[PDB]
Design a binder for this molecule. Sequence first.
Ligand SMILES: [Zn+2]
Ligand SMILES: [Zn+2]
Ligand SMILES: [Zn+2]
Lengths: 56, 48, 143, 196, 158, 88, 56
Amino acid sequence: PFDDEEPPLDYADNILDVEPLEAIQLELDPEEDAPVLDWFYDHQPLRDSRKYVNGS
Amino acid sequence: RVALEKSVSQKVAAAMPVRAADKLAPAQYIRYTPSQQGVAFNSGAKQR
Amino acid sequence: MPKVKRSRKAPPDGWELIEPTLDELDQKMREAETEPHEGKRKVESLWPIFRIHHQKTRYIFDLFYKRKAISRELYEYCIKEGYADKNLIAKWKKQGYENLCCLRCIQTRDTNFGTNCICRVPKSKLEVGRIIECTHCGCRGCS
Amino acid sequence: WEDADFPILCQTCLGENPYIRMTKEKYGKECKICARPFTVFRWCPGVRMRFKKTEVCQTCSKLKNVCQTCLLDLEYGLPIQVRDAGLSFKDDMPKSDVNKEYYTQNMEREISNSDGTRPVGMLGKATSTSDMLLKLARTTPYYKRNRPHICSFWVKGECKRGEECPYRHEKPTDPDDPLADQNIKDRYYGINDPVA
Amino acid sequence: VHLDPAVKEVQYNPTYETMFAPEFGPENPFRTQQMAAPRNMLSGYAEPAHINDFMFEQQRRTFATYGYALDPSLDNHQVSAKYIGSVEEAEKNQGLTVFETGQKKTEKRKKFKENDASNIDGFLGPWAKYVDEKDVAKPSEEEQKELDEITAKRQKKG
Amino acid sequence: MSEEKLQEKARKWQQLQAKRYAEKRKFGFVDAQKEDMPPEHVRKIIRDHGDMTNRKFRHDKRVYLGALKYMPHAVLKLLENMPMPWEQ
Amino acid sequence: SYQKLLKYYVLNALKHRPPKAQKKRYLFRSFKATKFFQSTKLDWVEVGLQVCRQGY
Ligand SMILES: [Zn+2]
Ligand SMILES: [Zn+2]
Ligand SMILES: [Zn+2]
């Protein structure tokens, strides 16, 4: 993607301020997929909820 | 066997050098008598 | 211009009245991250970073426990987004540790003998007036 | 390789305070003479001073009978050249590097097979006391030896870091003085040592 | 009496009288100061202590702050304890350590404070400079010239 | 033997024992975790050192070579944690 | 292509031997116990550039 003589771009000023584009994620069907909808696409979905996973 | 297995271990320690960091905290005290005693040298004491 | 939010949910109630100073502190960090190490020692160049990190964390800390200007929700929002340091706050709520620099300056493992730095020693106990600057941090005596 | 549990050190190097904290570093540096790796011990000799370290291994230290740091003699604190010349003594140890290596292994062989805790091979050649040495020898410390180095930026005239500066802000010795040009090797062998 | 002076690792329990009684005879003159002292290694006698960490560290700290300490040696004379070093300040300061409320508490140095973290480029919490003694020191009008000479004299050699 | 000196002796003794057998100095004590530094800290370090051409950092060249025997670990742990297509 | 996927599947499960009960030794814990290492929380894209810069 970068030509061989191009030095690797410094994250601190090329990428750090750029708003990220929208991911691939599917639009769930609201009235019907409701118990999954709140948390489905999070990184480690229910990590902060003792009722569903044990902890960090 | 204590003499040889120790020397064995020093050889065997070469075989795997990077499997983990060593762990080291035997922070020991030793008491010392400086031989060349004098009233001035140790600021007074016989020992350090 | 302001920092990318990692949360996507809307910010809490009192967000708009803490934004001039919080975004300006983030502008202050971006300067010191880029100033030249030329006229300064190897270890001295890292000192402004520990200082502004202290200042950001102190600012949220004062508005919640002292001035009571901020709810639980906005308080924990600023911690999550990286405006404050969760760990640094916990020492400030302890008895003696209340103007602490860094985690480094109390981390006993980061030293040979396994003790603190002279940073942490009370100024009345040194009795000789040796001006102090910490190599970890630059501090002249927290305690 | 030389692995020792305690450095051979004189009282002036060791410090004015009888409670000492020191760090032991296995094979941290090469010996300034024989180039062999040795265990480096480093300690703070007092309130304000250089935070010293051992410069030569115990092997080289044994042969001359000198402190591992200052290379002044454990019996008198004089320099090596003064002590040997006063007893009309001379060292047969080779000066070229390849022959020094050969000699090094020989002494290694000797100390390992003998008791080895002793100068007595090299001291035995000249055991006699001399009125010259006993008059000159230090009865008391010389802590001024220990004082910090000179600040090079301050000599340049733009001393940043201000009054914090642990290095000394005083005039260095004039370069035209023959006493400045000292060398560890020359002090160890005892050749052209100006202090002597 | 019955115990060799050249002895180690005694397997039984010797009585005081059969272990501490004198070696007989005259001393030889053929032994210098280093040779006569009971050394285990070239410069002296090294033996493993187990002194309690809090007490070592306290006394060590105490000497650096003041210049007196309580003597760590374990024979000397078994008669009376003493301080060491600048013993005059031991009786003066009533023998305190660093880990105590000090006797002297006066003439503290003055520094700024702006403990608010609200004014950008004005906060200085524990990084506060003393107000009197200030940066960018240089020592003289004329010492500079003398150091200029010394550097010039160094240029003449190479 | 003055009662004044006794009271000072009591004060000395009390302080000494309290810190000697203080709870944070018990045999089983393990000091607190190494908690995280600010993220800007490592950012400046990498950007300062650049490509090790500068004179100043020349001490650290030895470490930058010596670290190479753990680079396959770093490569492994990096790709293992790669973000999934639903994550920004 | 189907058939050659089965080949590597069968061989793995056949030549499987149980774990030898080797003693646990955590590499990165031994590292971070030492003064030379520190820890922080960073964007994956920032770290990826750093590893490439370091490896270069
Ligand atoms: Zn600090
Ligand atoms: Zn500190
Ligand atoms: Zn501090």
